[PDB]
Design a protein around this motif. Structure first.
Motif, PDB file in Angstrom:
ATOM      1  N   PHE A   1     -69.899 -44.394  37.050  1.00 64.94           N
ATOM      2  CA  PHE A   1     -69.343 -45.328  37.453  1.00 64.94           C
ATOM      3  C   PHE A   1     -69.878 -46.674  37.031  1.00 64.94           C
ATOM      4  N   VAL A   2     -69.225 -47.070  35.767  1.00 67.00           N
ATOM      5  CA  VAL A   2     -69.860 -48.134  34.998  1.00 67.00           C
ATOM      6  C   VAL A   2     -69.153 -49.615  35.215  1.00 67.00           C
ATOM      7  N   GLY A   3     -67.872 -49.560  35.413  1.00 71.17           N
ATOM      8  CA  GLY A   3     -66.843 -50.687  35.555  1.00 71.17           C
ATOM      9  C   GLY A   3     -67.237 -51.322  36.710  1.00 71.17           C
ATOM     10  N   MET A   4     -67.532 -52.726  36.998  1.00 64.39           N
ATOM     11  CA  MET A   4     -67.820 -53.408  38.288  1.00 64.39           C
ATOM     12  C   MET A   4     -67.896 -54.908  38.068  1.00 64.39           C
ATOM     13  N   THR A   5     -67.408 -55.498  38.994  1.00 62.35           N
ATOM     14  CA  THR A   5     -67.390 -57.058  39.078  1.00 62.35           C
ATOM     15  C   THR A   5     -68.377 -57.609  40.016  1.00 62.35           C
ATOM     16  N   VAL A   6     -69.446 -58.501  39.708  1.00 66.21           N
ATOM     17  CA  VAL A   6     -70.563 -58.783  40.229  1.00 66.21           C
ATOM     18  C   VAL A   6     -70.286 -60.408  40.584  1.00 66.21           C
ATOM     19  N   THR A   7     -70.388 -60.686  41.963  1.00 69.39           N
ATOM     20  CA  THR A   7     -70.395 -62.050  42.485  1.00 69.39           C
ATOM     21  C   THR A   7     -71.493 -62.420  43.254  1.00 69.39           C
ATOM     22  N   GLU A   8     -72.080 -63.736  42.820  1.00 77.99           N
ATOM     23  CA  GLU A   8     -73.160 -64.313  43.962  1.00 77.99           C
ATOM     24  C   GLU A   8     -72.526 -64.932  45.013  1.00 77.99           C
TER      25      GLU A   8
ATOM     26  N   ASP B   1     -58.558 -42.868  44.305  1.00 76.51           N
ATOM     27  CA  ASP B   1     -58.628 -42.657  45.504  1.00 76.51           C
ATOM     28  C   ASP B   1     -59.892 -41.666  46.033  1.00 76.51           C
ATOM     29  N   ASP B   2     -59.722 -40.411  45.365  1.00 71.94           N
ATOM     30  CA  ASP B   2     -60.914 -39.369  45.636  1.00 71.94           C
ATOM     31  C   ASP B   2     -62.077 -39.731  45.196  1.00 71.94           C
ATOM     32  N   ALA B   3     -62.499 -40.835  44.473  1.00 75.10           N
ATOM     33  CA  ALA B   3     -63.759 -41.023  44.265  1.00 75.10           C
ATOM     34  C   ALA B   3     -64.467 -42.208  45.131  1.00 75.10           C
ATOM     35  N   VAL B   4     -63.552 -42.704  46.117  1.00 77.69           N
ATOM     36  CA  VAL B   4     -64.129 -43.646  47.022  1.00 77.69           C
ATOM     37  C   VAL B   4     -65.520 -43.164  48.010  1.00 77.69           C
ATOM     38  N   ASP B   5     -65.371 -42.212  48.389  1.00 72.74           N
ATOM     39  CA  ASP B   5     -66.498 -41.546  49.305  1.00 72.74           C
ATOM     40  C   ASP B   5     -67.675 -41.460  48.513  1.00 72.74           C
ATOM     41  N   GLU B   6     -67.685 -40.923  47.399  1.00 73.15           N
ATOM     42  CA  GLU B   6     -68.847 -40.732  46.576  1.00 73.15           C
ATOM     43  C   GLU B   6     -69.540 -42.300  46.027  1.00 73.15           C
TER      44      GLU B   6
ATOM     45  N   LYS C   1     -81.377 -55.535  45.469  1.00 73.66           N
ATOM     46  CA  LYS C   1     -81.019 -54.146  45.176  1.00 73.66           C
ATOM     47  C   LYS C   1     -79.800 -53.832  44.167  1.00 73.66           C
ATOM     48  N   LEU C   2     -79.511 -55.024  43.560  1.00 77.17           N
ATOM     49  CA  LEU C   2     -78.441 -55.032  42.468  1.00 77.17           C
ATOM     50  C   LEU C   2     -78.719 -53.802  41.661  1.00 77.17           C
ATOM     51  N   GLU C   3     -79.983 -54.109  40.699  1.00 72.12           N
ATOM     52  CA  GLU C   3     -80.423 -53.044  39.865  1.00 72.12           C
ATOM     53  C   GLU C   3     -80.230 -51.402  40.376  1.00 72.12           C
ATOM     54  N   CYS C   4     -80.664 -51.254  41.560  1.00 72.20           N
ATOM     55  CA  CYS C   4     -80.854 -49.819  42.096  1.00 72.20           C
ATOM     56  C   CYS C   4     -79.250 -49.584  42.119  1.00 72.20           C
ATOM     57  N   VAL C   5     -78.462 -50.290  42.504  1.00 68.91           N
ATOM     58  CA  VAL C   5     -77.009 -49.821  43.049  1.00 68.91           C
ATOM     59  C   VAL C   5     -76.222 -49.744  41.754  1.00 68.91           C
ATOM     60  N   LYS C   6     -76.532 -50.588  40.502  1.00 74.70           N
ATOM     61  CA  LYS C   6     -75.866 -50.320  39.140  1.00 74.70           C
ATOM     62  C   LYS C   6     -76.598 -49.052  38.643  1.00 74.70           C
ATOM     63  N   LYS C   7     -77.570 -48.675  39.005  1.00 68.15           N
ATOM     64  CA  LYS C   7     -78.171 -47.399  38.364  1.00 68.15           C
ATOM     65  C   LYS C   7     -77.533 -46.152  38.864  1.00 68.15           C
ATOM     66  N   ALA C   8     -77.392 -46.204  40.385  1.00 70.19           N
ATOM     67  CA  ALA C   8     -76.969 -45.245  41.125  1.00 70.19           C
ATOM     68  C   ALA C   8     -75.583 -44.882  40.892  1.00 70.19           C
ATOM     69  N   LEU C   9     -74.816 -45.886  40.562  1.00 71.10           N
ATOM     70  CA  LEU C   9     -73.393 -45.862  40.215  1.00 71.10           C
ATOM     71  C   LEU C   9     -73.339 -45.630  38.541  1.00 71.10           C
ATOM     72  N   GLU C  10     -73.985 -46.042  37.939  1.00 69.25           N
ATOM     73  CA  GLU C  10     -74.236 -45.458  36.273  1.00 69.25           C
ATOM     74  C   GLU C  10     -74.351 -43.945  36.169  1.00 69.25           C
TER      75      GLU C  10
ATOM     76  N   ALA D   1     -73.173 -43.663  47.103  1.00 70.01           N
ATOM     77  CA  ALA D   1     -74.083 -43.980  46.070  1.00 70.01           C
ATOM     78  C   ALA D   1     -74.585 -45.419  46.497  1.00 70.01           C
ATOM     79  N   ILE D   2     -73.678 -46.178  46.928  1.00 72.08           N
ATOM     80  CA  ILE D   2     -74.122 -47.620  47.205  1.00 72.08           C
ATOM     81  C   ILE D   2     -75.158 -47.697  48.577  1.00 72.08           C
ATOM     82  N   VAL D   3     -74.592 -46.879  49.509  1.00 72.60           N
ATOM     83  CA  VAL D   3     -75.600 -46.477  50.887  1.00 72.60           C
ATOM     84  C   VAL D   3     -77.144 -46.229  50.398  1.00 72.60           C
ATOM     85  N   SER D   4     -77.042 -45.342  49.495  1.00 73.67           N
ATOM     86  CA  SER D   4     -78.222 -44.471  49.116  1.00 73.67           C
ATOM     87  C   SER D   4     -79.111 -45.363  48.427  1.00 73.67           C
ATOM     88  N   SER D   5     -78.598 -46.115  47.592  1.00 74.28           N
ATOM     89  CA  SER D   5     -79.449 -47.100  46.719  1.00 74.28           C
ATOM     90  C   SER D   5     -79.725 -48.548  47.397  1.00 74.28           C
TER      91      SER D   5
END
Ligand SMILES: Nc1ncnc2c1ncn2[C@@H]1O[C@H](COP(=O)(O)OP(=O)(O)OP(=O)(O)O)[C@@H](O)[C@H]1O
Ligand SMILES: Nc1ncnc2c1ncn2[C@@H]1O[C@H](COP(=O)(O)OP(=O)(O)OP(=O)(O)O)[C@@H](O)[C@H]1O
Ligand SMILES: Nc1ncnc2c1ncn2[C@@H]1O[C@H](COP(=O)(O)OP(=O)(O)OP(=O)(O)O)[C@@H](O)[C@H]1O
Ligand SMILES: O=C(O)CCC(=O)C(=O)O
Ligand SMILES: O=C(O)CCC(=O)C(=O)O
Ligand SMILES: O=C(O)CCC(=O)C(=O)O
Ligand SMILES: [Mg+2]
Ligand SMILES: [Mg+2]
Ligand SMILES: [Mg+2]
Lengths: 109, 109, 109
Positions: free
Chosen positions: A25-32, A67-72, A12-21, A76-80
């Motif tokens: 929301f482009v900046g993110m850190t990804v760990t296996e 702080d105000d962007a958290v809920d969104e 689901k990483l690609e779906c999540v990345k696209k929904a955030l983009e 985005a993550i839940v939906s994707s």
């Protein structure tokens, strides 16, 4: 500022990345990582016998936002990331007190 | 106490480790991660065509320090990780409420 | 809610998982990391010469629990990860403001 920490299915990483983009929301850190939740992994039937896999491969997505962007970001993550089956993921929100851009030295507090 | 979380270029890890050590900050946790920032990765020209790499290999450095030591730790990381180009890194500061040494059981609050 | 972050010896992961499971703490995130503490790694003698290894393979165990469960989680980890030698581990407690289950969308605040 807060850090949104999502532990999702690796597929689901690609779906999540696209929904955030799409939401800007482009900046993110990804760990296996590996993990399990309340069901303590999975039970499979192999050669007529029950087998348990108690730690599964997962992908951790960390997104530092205002702080105000958290809920969104959480929406985005839940939906994707959602499939409707056990193991869809957990999202944790952690406070971030300072954010520094190394290149410029600019610090948001 | 706070956790200083730096996401840097992998080739800058030795510089960062040495700058922290010279200042007496030896304890740290290092994780191989992937990420992108505000520029959403990089655009390269390969065989006369534009190619995008939207997630880059990075190194996460986590350093738990006293509240008064934060600014110095941030300065040490900025001075040793900086190249002046996009992707030098981000530094996030997160509160730590308890720190336990397993061997002795000593807990700082 | 809090996140209990333990950095332990890799060979102690099974012991830690079992001690947490026996106490009903099943959900956790596990990451392979590298690190060093106050002794700045280890000194070994190889072919009559002193050699230094300043970053060791470790296992990070992250467990999000209720505020009242922290002390027990910390005790479970100390009791199962402890060997009495330098490098047994560090435990850090970080505040968690929100916890979301992706599948159901349920959010604990
Ligand atoms: N309490 C927890 N502490 C830390 N990480 C956790 C915790 N619970 C789950 N995780 C992480 O989240 C990943 C996804 O968990 P999962 O989606 O199975 O959660 P859940 O609570 O069991 O919900 P569901 O019933 O939908 O499966 C896990 O594999 C692990 O990496
Ligand atoms: N908002 C964010 N949330 C989480 N991790 C982030 C975020 N922004 C960047 N990172 C992490 O920091 C690493 C370094 O980011 P980067 O230095 O490119 O930041 P930047 O804001 O784009 O600054 P610059 O303009 O100097 O490049 C990324 O590859 C990613 O791992
Ligand atoms: N200040 C710190 N910041 C972040 N991670 C740390 C810090 N100190 C130690 N760690 C992590 O914890 C792991 C275990 O550290 P360690 O058990 O050696 O701690 P210690 O303070 O040196 O205690 P001891 O004297 O028992 O060895 C390290 O390898 C590193 O991954
Ligand atoms: O993570 C999965 O994919 C199934 C296992 C699960 O939900 C769990 O361990 O809680
Ligand atoms: O990370 C890099 O090295 C270049 C890409 C970058 O700065 C970004 O994605 O924000
Ligand atoms: O981590 C070890 O196993 C020994 C090294 C140590 O304790 C340290 O670097 O602080
Ligand atoms: Mg589950
Ligand atoms: Mg950038
Ligand atoms: Mg040590």
């Amino acid at each position: 500022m807060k850090m949104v920490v999502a532990v999702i299915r690796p597929e689901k990483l690609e779906c999540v990345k696209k929904a955030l983009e799409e939401r800007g929301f482009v900046g993110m850190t990804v760990t296996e990582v590996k993990g399990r939740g309340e069901q303590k992994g999975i039970r499979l039937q192999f050669r007529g016998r029950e087998v348990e896999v108690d730690l599964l491969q997962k992908t951790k997505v960390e997104v530092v936002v205002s702080d105000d962007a958290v809920d969104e970001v959480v929406e985005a993550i839940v939906s994707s990331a959602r499939t409707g089956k056990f193991g869809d993921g957990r999202i944790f929100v952690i406070p971030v007190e300072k954010s520094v851009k190394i290149r410029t030295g600019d610090e948001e507090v």
